[PDB]
Write an enzyme that holds these catalytic residues in place. Structure first.
Site, PDB file in Angstrom:
ATOM      1  N   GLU A  42      -2.811   9.515  -8.469  1.00 24.62           N
ATOM      2  CA  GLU A  42      -2.469  10.410  -7.363  1.00 24.62           C
ATOM      3  C   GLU A  42      -0.957  10.486  -7.211  1.00 24.62           C
ATOM      4  OE1 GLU A  42      -4.190   9.667  -3.518  1.00 24.62           O
ATOM      5  OE2 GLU A  42      -6.149   9.142  -4.383  1.00 24.62           O
ATOM      6  N   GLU A  92      -7.372   2.507  -3.700  1.00 22.81           N
ATOM      7  CA  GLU A  92      -6.449   2.009  -2.678  1.00 22.81           C
ATOM      8  C   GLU A  92      -7.060   0.956  -1.788  1.00 22.81           C
ATOM      9  OE1 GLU A  92      -4.653   5.284  -0.564  1.00 22.81           O
ATOM     10  OE2 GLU A  92      -3.545   5.948  -2.324  1.00 22.81           O
TER      11      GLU A  92
END
Length: 447
Positions: free
Chosen positions: A354, A168
């Site tokens: 995720e 991320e």
């Protein structure tokens, strides 16, 4: 509703995920030096309720309890991160043997239980020593990252075959250097844009470092948290604003790593001179073996002249279902993003690295939790994955965030994402209904 998983190939990878600072604790033990998240947790007001990662789940000392959960789930794979300041504590020079030995042992134990390690190199815990040199606004940090990648790949890359460079980067860059809500808490768009550049450079240098250093050839990818960006109304202004958000959240990361350069509309929006050197674009576009999609929510976007540079704001999503941190539940968005990666970006292999949700848990005295909303979120997003596969997407696996409750960054411990409940005072981990359902679903798919 009960999800049907039979359309998924038998070599689909069933996984679950954690990260080092969120679970390990032992922040001053066995040679570790502080990360920028250690530092951020000392800033009054930075973390809800004054929580810190000093102890967290104590997984540095309680790893066998995590392994017991993983065996109970029956997952094929475990996604975890390496703590850079545990392995190269100053970010340069000496390797901390004890720190690297911990991860060597984790890898051996996983493989002894038939579980494949999926290793994240950078999950936000930059050594504070490198931040003291300017952090991600210092190009040198990307080369420090590559050196770290080579150390870890040389040690673990005979056994670990599946690698994530960065987790991320939007969070590191925009939330850590523009919004200031994540470490290091900087609020400066120019620093943030340069940091995004040096993060992407670090990704590319890290791919090359892993391919050079791993004794066996690695499969390497970036992990990005994507959100479909949809206009709050059909006004031309809202449509354009949602497209700027799409660039900020999605295309800034996907375009240059795909060899399409940085998106011109966003370069013009930011107005920041990129710290570019000849050959950098080819490094950032280093060939990868998969893309990792982290997905939690879409974003509804309105034009908003009060937001400097970007000129857009997120507004609440319309679905009735929202998690305890007010994230709209929207499984269709996962189907849509998987298909966008396959169709618009030609991705050859996609993992959901995720996906998960946080709800108020009501444990009994022995920490048993029946969490029907977390379970339903899981089943509906798995159904979205199945639909994407039926439409041809090369989806290779799914990783539930998270194995157990842990430190959720500036929210602290209040948002519990775990398939297993953690009693933080004792470290006791007890599988929730959601985790037991996930184990049942995995077993039924393999049958």
């Amino acid at each position: 509703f009960m999800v049907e998983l039979s359309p998924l190939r038998q070599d689909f990878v069933w996984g679950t995920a954690t990260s080092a600072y969120q679970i390990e604790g032992a922040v001053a033990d066995d040679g570790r030096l502080p990360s920028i998240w250690d530092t951020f947790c000392r800033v009054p007001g930075a973390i809800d309720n004054g929580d810190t990662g000093d102890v967290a789940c104590d997984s540095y000392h309680r790893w066998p309890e995590d392994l017991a959960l993983l065996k109970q789930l029956g997952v094929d794979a475990y996604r975890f991160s390496i703590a850079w300041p545990r392995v190269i504590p100053t970010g340069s020079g000496a390797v901390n043997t004890a720190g690297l030995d911990y991860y060597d042992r984790v890898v051996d134990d996983l493989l002894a239980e038939g579980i494949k390690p999926f290793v994240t190199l950078y999950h936000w815990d930059l050594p504070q020593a490198l931040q003291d040199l300017g952090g991600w606004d210092n190009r040198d940090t990307a080369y420090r990252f590559a050196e770290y990648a080579a150390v870890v790949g040389a040690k673990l890359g005979d056994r670990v075959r599946d690698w994530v460079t960065l987790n991320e980067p939007l969070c590191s860059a925009w939330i850590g250097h523009w919004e200031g809500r994540m470490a290091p808490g900087i609020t400066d768009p120019a620093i943030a844009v340069r940091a995004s550049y040096n993060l992407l450079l670090a990704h590319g240098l890290g791919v090359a470092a892993l391919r050079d250093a791993c004794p066996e050839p690695p499969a390497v990818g970036l992990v990005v948290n994507l959100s479909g960006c949809e206009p709050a109304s059909q006004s031309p202004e809202d449509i354009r604003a949602a497209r700027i958000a799409d660039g900020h959240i999605n295309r800034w990361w996907l375009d240059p790593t795909s060899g399409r350069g940085f998106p011109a509309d966003m370069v013009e929006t930011y107005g920041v001179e990129l710290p570019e050197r000849p050959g950098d674009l080819e490094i950032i576009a280093a060939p990868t073996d998969f893309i990792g999609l982290n997905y939690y929510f879409r974003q509804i976007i309105e034009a908003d002249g009060s937001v400097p540079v970007l000129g857009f704001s997120q507004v609440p999503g319309p679905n009735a279902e929202h998690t305890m941190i007010d994230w709209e539940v929207h499984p269709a968005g996962l189907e849509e993003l998987i298909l966008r990666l396959a169709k618009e970006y030609g991705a050859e292999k996609i993992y959901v690295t995720e996906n998960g949700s946080a709800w108020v848990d009501q444990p009994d005295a022995e920490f048993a939790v029946d969490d029907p909303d977390r379970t339903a979120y899981l089943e509906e997003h798995l159904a979205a994955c199945v639909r994407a596969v039926e439409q041809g997407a090369p989806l290779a696996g799914y990783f539930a965030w998270s194995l157990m409750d842990n430190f959720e960054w500036a929210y602290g411990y209040a948002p519990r994402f775990g398939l297993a409940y953690v009693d933080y005072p004792t470290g006791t981990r007890v599988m929730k209904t959601s985790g037991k359902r996930y184990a049942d679903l995995i077993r039924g798919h393999r049958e």
